[model samples]
Structures are given as structure tokens and as C-alpha cells.
Target: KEMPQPKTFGELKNLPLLNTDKPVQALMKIADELGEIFKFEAPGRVTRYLSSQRLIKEACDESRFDKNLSQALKFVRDFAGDGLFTSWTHEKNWKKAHNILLPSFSQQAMKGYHAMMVDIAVQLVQKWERLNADEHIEVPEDMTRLTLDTIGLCGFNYRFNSFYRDQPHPFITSMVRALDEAMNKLQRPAYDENKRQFQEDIKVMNDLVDKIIADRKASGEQSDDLLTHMLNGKDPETGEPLDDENIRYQIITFLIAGHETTSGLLSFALYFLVKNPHVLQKAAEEAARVLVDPVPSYKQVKQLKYVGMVLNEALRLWPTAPAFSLYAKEDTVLGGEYPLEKGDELMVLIPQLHRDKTIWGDDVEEFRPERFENPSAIPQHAFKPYGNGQRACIGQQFALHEATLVLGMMLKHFDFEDHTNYELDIKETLTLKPEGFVVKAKSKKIPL
Candidate 1:
């Protein structure tokens, strides 16, 4: 139960903060020490002293953990309220957003995305179908492009026409890179002085994104897309519309969270499925069972239970939103122990709970979907792919829908072959991502 002290962020960097790795235990070791510093019940702020570099704050208060689970998940959910991604996953607004974007997903939505993916997949495969071809391609970059294209097609009434366009919007490109840089800086040691540079980058990107949003409003381009829905959404609680800042936050969250998180997990899932022939076989079978005659529709999404669980399992192992910021709102207790105080931030390690041998059983490290086969099987607070409490991922439903659709569809046509000398370099800034990861994928020809 004892762990060695970490000398630098690099040493700590090797420790896992998000994904299931030995490093996570190390990160927990460090975080546990920091978390322990805020043990006494007081209104003290829980601030992390990053090695003379970035003084990142995870929580202002520590009482939040003491609240009910619903209350616990509320902060994140509330922050994501009614945004495009949030609305897509919010239970109440899901139907509303779906109804508004009905044509996009109706029979048409599934068909369009499926066709889009098929075309994309075919193009990707074409590069590999040749003799002695390289099966690995730029997975992260391509996936980001795909999500951008998909968001335009599905979320926007009109096609932003990404991929096939002359070029992506300058603002879009700059904004993404800027955010990536900012996130990178946030994760680095304070001595790096990258935060100041990244902060400026974020400000520039925000300014540009805001300007484009203003242009959309002034140009009055008429489309019943997600952008319009978000701008026009009136809070049910107050019947008041959201502000421009609120709108910007929502859009940026999706622009960053949607594409980045889903793509990261997709890469993980695809890599795992390709490596594990049996799982891929099961996924293909399951996908076919649901989308045999037609592509997966919203109604049919329910039938892809196993596919959803597979994604959940992947997320558990390789969580995109691994650790999150939470604080005690007041003096409180957590896990029926540990006195917490106001303003003390607590970084809830969801991955730790998910991969804990005691909570998930001894085989926690294995890639197993069947672990989630029983609804009530796992203990409370043990497994949370999105999160728990009110702060859970509001885009949970939307993300699951997209991942299931994409992976399920791909499984149908591909056997996910190859295990080339692949190396997954783990990096964390905004989300955990693989660097220079390689997988050999080829078309499935059900063997003569």
C-alpha cells in the first residue's frame, strides 16, 4: 500500500491520472498526498502547487462529495446545460433536440452518417487494400476531421462541408490547435511557463470563435441545426435564453469535448477490437443483428446494448475524462470517512474506482464488457464511464449514440486485421490521446 515520492511532474507524468496503467496508481499516490493536505474542516481553498509552473485548482470547495450522488454530478451537468452536446445527452432535452434535428437522424440521420462513415472507411481501406500496403493511417487527425464533418452534417442543418471543402475554416483550425496547446500547457509543470503562452492562445481562439458566432447571428443564415437550437434554447427553469458567453462555452465544449473525447476512445476501441479478434467478431455479430437491413436509427440504437457496453468498457479502461475537478461546498464526509471542508478541492479518480481490484473484482485490468452485463453487478461509486453525481457527463447519451453508431457500422464491413509494430504513446492535455499509434485494418471478405 506504500508508494515512493515523485520528484518532478515527469515522474508524476508517468503515473496514470486518467487511463488504466501503473502510472495511475502513481498519480493517485501524489494526488492522495495533496488531497490529504485539505483534511481539516475549514473554508480553505484546495489549490495544487504545480512545480513552480501552473497552480491549477481542481476544487474551490470540498463539501460537494458529501452531497447526494445526484448533487455530486450536478456541477458538471449544470455547466453543460442545454449545449449542443449536452442537449443531445440530457434526458429531458434529448427527445427535444432529437425532434428538432429529427430529419438529420430520423431514417435520414442514420443513413447519412452511415454513408458518410462508409465512404470514409472505404477511402481509408482503399489505401490498404493494395498488396503490401500500410494499414496504419493518421487516426486522431482523421477522426477529428470526421467528427467536424459529422457535426456539420448532423448538428448543423446545412453542411459546413468539412473534409470535402476547399479548406476548413481558419478559425476552426486555429481554435482547435489553440485549445490543444492550452490544454498541453495546463498539464505541464509550472516552470515550463507554457501556461501564459497557452492562455494567450486560448484567448485568441475564443475571440475568433466568438466572432464567427456573431457573424452567424448577423448573417441570419436560416437552418434548424444544433447551433440554432442552442442559441435559441430557453431555460425551462427561467424561460430565459442563454447569453453569448454561455453559447460560446457550449460550442467550445462540444468542439473540444465531442470530437476529441469520442475520437480518442474510438482509437482505443478500434485498436482493442482489431487486436482482440474474438471481441471484434462479437461486435460485428451484434452490429449486424441491429443494423442488418438498415443502418442504425435512433430507435435501433437501443438494441445495440452490447455495443454500448463495449464502449463503456473501453472508456473504463481508457477514460477520456478520467479525473475531474470537485470541491467540498461545506464541511462534509466522503466514502463514509475523511473529513472534508469548504474550498478544498478533491480530484475524484473515477478510473481508480473503475479499475480497482476490490470494486471491479480481481480481473479489473482485462478488457471485459461482460463485467457490465448485470445492471446491479458493480458496487455503487465503483464504475462510472461518464461520472457520477450531478456532475456526470451530460453528453453521455449523445456520445454513446455516436460511438455505437460509428463502431457498430465499421464492425459490419471490417474484420479489423493487423498488429503491426504498434506503439501507443500516451499523452494528456485536454484528454488522453495515443501518439504514433498503429493498427492494421483491412476489409472483411467472409473467406470463400
Candidate 2:
């Protein structure tokens, strides 16, 4: 039987896990000190953490039988209030919202958005071409802009034109700040300058989203995109259309969650490929075979199997949404061994689990796309980049397709030159982000 290590409030404050600059590393250090399961106080509350794979599987499997069990922390959910942000929802409300929004990410739905997605990929390629040959592009930052533009068009039928902007688009800037503030508020809820700015940033985003809704209503225009899907949807239980608040929440959710995570995956994928020469050549060769132009069709993207493997390996190493909370509604035993009381919070540390040597072998840190070639060799619940079970990310397929298109198209035209001394400097707020990640793009000079 495992015992929970309790930490004093002051002691918890002193822990490295509180450092935003490298929170995941801090958490891993804590796991080393306190083992896989421990309890600690965060300001006014106490929460538990778990990193064991068997325990994770048990908790997720049990979540199906008890809808009320898998609730996110109020601290977490408040980040995106009354939306699909894991923290802002209860089981009942989550089910209703999730069911209504399910159709938005379906294959039929994504098909209508592919041309727009491919066009955005083309815009990124065009931007790369205009940059000076010696210039170093921050791969993560550029990819984030690319994804932001893609989501703007496909998600809300809005065009951010992020690549054309001298600075980031206002909406992206505001959203990034808002997310940063939200993460800060989670640990220390002090009255400060950030709090005031957070409110202002949110207002900018909410007002813009509201205006989009109002304009669409005035025009009475219908399109095959996520906004239309949500606008036209009805609550399954109440049989009523989503109100302004709900619509705003869904739009913001898609805008944030859809793009940010995918951008990180793309950034890391490129970094990993550049680091591994043989893997890069293999993936690029596969992309060359299937990639016909700067913009690839959905079918062509599907055919790049090696590109898919590279992505899977990248995500395995650097899952953007590194940690998520799940609660138990009733007292339960995890792995038929560890006991979890009702309302106990389980922090699933995805990065720790992804790299567990017991599960991924001794060379877990190595960048090898071939590891994913035999999917059956790994346990089903072991490699959950999108998460596990019913609560897994809904936009997963949409993300995979978009990432595949961008990577497949770009790899054909450019060979990303690595900074040999570059270390993985990660910053963690609400998402895992690579800091100062710069790569030089050498044009393959493929004939058009």
C-alpha cells in the first residue's frame, strides 16, 4: 500500500514545481522525492498527484461508470469558465456540452474545412520564402501563428492573417496573455497588475467573439465550419439552441485548444527530425512521395505514414497539455491497490508517463519514429497524447490532419537546419511551450 506524502503550505510554496519556467521538470523532481502519489496544498486547497500508468488506466476506465467522478479542479476549470476547458465543467454539464459539440470535429465536418486549412499551410510556406536565407525563424512561434490563422478561418470563419502581420494579431496576443494570467492565478490568487490586465485581455477576446456572433446573425449567413455547427446546434437534453455565453465559450475553446497544442506538436516534430538525420530523411522522403504541391489535399496527407509516425513520436516526448486533473466522485481503489477517496484529485502527468522507462524502455528519451511503427506493441492506454477515454480531445482528428498537411508540405520544400547547441528550454503556463526555439530553413529549391 502506498502512503500519500503531505506537504506543509510553506513547504509546498518552496517546491520547484511552482516555477513556471520549468514546472514539468519540477514536477518530475517531486515525483522522484515523493514517489508517484502524494498530496500537497495549493494556497487554500489540497490536491493529490499520480504518475503511475496502471493507476492512470484504472482511474480512466472507472470514469466511464461514474459520470460525476471525472470532474476537473475549480482552479483549472475557471481558466475558461462555462466552456469545455476541463476545469470549468462538471460531469453533467460537460456531457451536455460535449454531446452538442461532438459533430463539430467529425470527419464530415473536417472535410469541409480542409481546403481552408491547406490554404493556410500555403501562406506559411510563402512567408518562409520571403525571409532572408540567413535568418533564424522561431519555429514554435511561426507554427503558432500558422495554426492561429488556420483555426481563425476553419473554426470561426474569421481570418487572422497572422503571417501578414508585423506583430501577432490582437486576438492572439490577448488570448496568450489571458492564458498566462489564468495560469498565474491558479497558484497565487493575489491582487496585482496581472489580474487587472487579465480582465482587460478577456474583455477584448469576449467582445470580439460576441461581435462575430452578432454579425453572423445579422447577415444570416451559414457556412460549413465549427461556428455554424455550434450556432445551429441544440442541447440534447433541453432541445434549445446554445446561448451567447455558450457559443462564446465554444469558440474560445476551439480557438485556444485547437491551435496551441497542434503548434507545439509541429514545433517539436521539426526539432526532433532535425536532431535525427536518418529519421528526417526517411520522413522527408515519405513526404516527397505523397506531397504534390505546397498545399496537399486531405488524401495526400493521409498517405504520409512516416510523417504520421514522426508526429506520434514527437507528441510522445513533448505532449503540450502535460498535466490534467481528474476527480473521483466516490472512494475507489486505483490499480486495485491504491485507495482514492471521493473528491480526491488525480493529476495525470502525461510527460512523466510518456517517458516512463518501464513502459517505453531504456531509450525512452531517444527520438525514434520507428517506435510507433508497431502500435500494438505498446499498450492502448500507455500512449495517450490526446488523453484517454471519453474526455480525450475532440479535435484530435482535425489536429492530426492539419499538422500532417503543414509538415508534409513544408518538409518537401525546406530542410530545417538545427542549432547544434540548442537545448530543450521549455516554459509551462497552461501549455508546454518551447522557449527561444529557432531553426534555419534551407530551401530544397524544388521546382514548381
Candidate 3:
């Protein structure tokens, strides 16, 4: 028989197969050196091959790392060092902007998200309602796609027919594939020789976005959606219109950050529920009680207590951007006294944080949505799915709303069955993706 897999961080690191290719290995070294889970103790800190305080500062200031959604495309085009600066683009602004824009989109797109989910839910229910007794029903990618497409439309007024066709467009493929590689490379140490591959991909992808931006503008189309909003948007504080590059950058950023998180979270949620039907049933019941007939709004999503808890649990279990690397600007105190030097790269091991027994209690590894029923139950900064304080994800509200709509619609009609042979390949890129959520779909009849 094959040896058992790791049950905890210590177990994972000590495995003979604990190869360097596994990024978690590096994180473990640091954790051991630190000697405390949450507290920062003073000592010689762990190091990464590449460390740059100047580069980090330049990326933050000149790149405007985070900007309004309306200006993302333009920002990406102009400031993103797609070739040379790939290391900091996402950190500089992609995720930062996601954090900033979460609230606005959540309020605007909740209705559209719910409507799209209802349409999918009804279809699933119709197809599976009369199926053979005790047959299992799986949620399709299109179910997730439709909800995401709605988010793109309502959030940016941009049209992405992700589920409207049989095959996804090249642009969509390129967008997802591009982000996967671009963001993943940043987390690892870079060699000077590898710069060409990085920038080449950047040029090709950025050129593609440029064409889309120009075409949209040439049509003289008027839209309240994200793209149009960016085209004519300006900072309320600065009173200056967002530039062209800014719009491109933010739009692309939203596409990657917004969509990927939803996909990853949904897959993991499904995985957990399939194994633990009790939580799934509870979530379904809560969704039925909370969602209004046509759809949910910002106000309604806020009231989804169980749904909210489930989403948070999923996030805690599998954050899309599980590990984040930040270079210390100067020696600083994190967790109180951890002596952080200017060049030491700090990797926020979210997977480790999410499963830490000290912070989350003994059942930290279990899927328990009820853990979040009382908000005060967990410590203030114990969880950092979207980071903390000044740079948290702005689009979290939007993410939550979209996720809720998709899960609610999917669970209403489909019954998830977890196959014992199923294995989760946690592909670590810019986001933590479960390759594909392969499931068996059994439709339910309509009008429940």
C-alpha cells in the first residue's frame, strides 16, 4: 500500500517526498524558524533568492498597484511590467484593486448574479427532477460560468459569453492561461535567463487586450458596465480622468481576480459538501429561505447567515491566492516581535493559517460552517483570505454575492456525490484551482 499523505504542516514537511518543487516546503522552513504561529519573534529571518525593497516600492508607487475598476485595463497596459515587472503586477494592483472594488460591484451585480443562477437552477431541476431514484447530480461548469458571466456584465457592463456557446473564445482561454502562469512565477525565485519567456507572454497578452480596448472605444458604445465606467471614470478625490492604460489593467485584473476566486471557492465548496451532506443541506435550506423569487440584492446577500458562513469556511479552507509573498520595506514587527528585515520576503502561508489549530480550534481541519455563526468566535487577524487592514480585497462583497448565487442555484437542483477515488490536485498558480470540478449531473424538475 502507498504511504499515507500528510495530516499537518509538520507531517507534510517531514515526508521523504518533501521536494523543493512543493512551495509549501519553503513555507515550513520559515514557520519552524519563527517558532510561533501568530506571534512575531526576533531572530535572523528566512530568505528567498530574490529580494528587492526598491523594486517593491517602485511597483507600489509608479504602478498605482491598485486603482478603480474603470481604470484597470489602462493601468495594466501602461504601468504593468508584463515582461520585466511580472513579479509585482498582481501584488502592485491586481489583488489590491480587487480588494478595493469588492463593495461597489457586490451592490451592483447581486441582482444579475441571482437572476442568472435561477435560470441555471431551473434548467438543472427540470432535467434531473425525474431521473432514476437515488441518482447523484453534479454542478456543471456552465452553472458557474453563467453566474460569472452575469458578474462580468453587471459588474463592468462588459459582455463575456462564457456559457452562451459550446467552446470558450480564445480571448477567454488566453486570459485564464496567461494569468495562471504570470502570477505563479512571481512567487518563486527568478533567474535572469528566464526573463524572455515572461515578457514575451506579456507582450502577446497585452497586445490582445489593447485590440479589445480600441475596438470597444471605436464603436462609441455607451455602457454603465465596467469598461464604459472606466472609459469615462475619474477619481472622486483626484478629480482627474483615468488614463487608457489604467482602464485596461484594471479590467484584466478584475477578469482574473474576480472569476478565478469564484471558481476555486465553488469547486472546494462542492467537494466539501459532497463529503459532508449535513453542511450542504444546511446551506441549501438557508439559501432557499434567503433568496427572493427572482434574485438576491446587496441587502439580501448580507442576510444569508448560513450561506455567508459556508463561503467563509470555503475561503478559510481553500483561498484562491493561498500563498502571498511580500518584501519587508524595513525591519518591522509582525505578530508583535518577529524581526523582519528589509530584504526578507514574507510569505503569508494562508493554507497554514487556515488550518492552524491554535487559532481555529481542534476541528480546524474539519468543514464546519457553524464555526463562523458567531463572528467574534475567531480572532481579529487570524484569517487573511483577502489580506488585512489597508490592503484587503475590495471586491470581497462581489465575490461573496456571486458565489452565494451560484451555490444556491446549483444546490437547489443538483445532488453532489463524492466519489471515493476522487483526488484533489491543488494546482498552485496565481490562484489555487482544482484542475476541473468533474462531477456527475442529474437534473431536477422545475418550479420547486
Best by lDDT: 2
The window of 10 residues in a row where model 2 has the poorest summed lDDT is 64-73
* Candidate 2 TM-score versus the reference: 0.90
Which has the better lDDT: candidate 1, or candidate 2? 2
- Clashes in each model (backbone N, CA, C under 3 Å)? 25, 2, 49
Query: lDDT of all predictions, in order shown?
Result: 0.55, 0.76, 0.55
Candidate 2 ranges with C-alpha deviation above 4 Å:
4-20, 32-35, 41-43, 63-79, 86-93, 187-192
Candidate 1 lDDT: 0.55
> On residues 1-448, what C-alpha lDDT tens digit does candidate 1 reach at each position?
1222333334334233333434334564454455322221112222221110011112222224322222223322333345444342335544444344333334333534444444443433343344255445666665666666555444443334455545676546655655555433323355455446545555665676577568779988755455676566666554555567656656655565577787788778876676677887888898777775534455666678888778888888878766555446677554344455675555555555455554567786788888778867665545565654444555566566677777776676555555665666766654666666665556664211
Worst 10 residues of 1 by lDDT: 49-58
Q: Using TM-score as the measure, name the better of candidate 2 and candidate 3.
A: 2
Q: Per-residue lDDT of 1-448 in model 3, one digit per residue for the tens?
A: 1212222234333333234445553544445454233222222223221112222232233222222121122233332432111224334343333333343455655554455434543443455555576554334354446545655565445556664566675556655555544444443545554455445656665676677679878888875456665566554544565556655666555666566667778777777777787888888777667765544454666677787788789888878766544555555543342454554454456666676666677786788888888887666556668744334565666677767766776665555666444676666545666655566555443256
Q: Residue 345 in model 2: shift from native, Å?
A: 1.0
The worst-scoring run of ten residues by lDDT in candidate 3 lies at 47-56
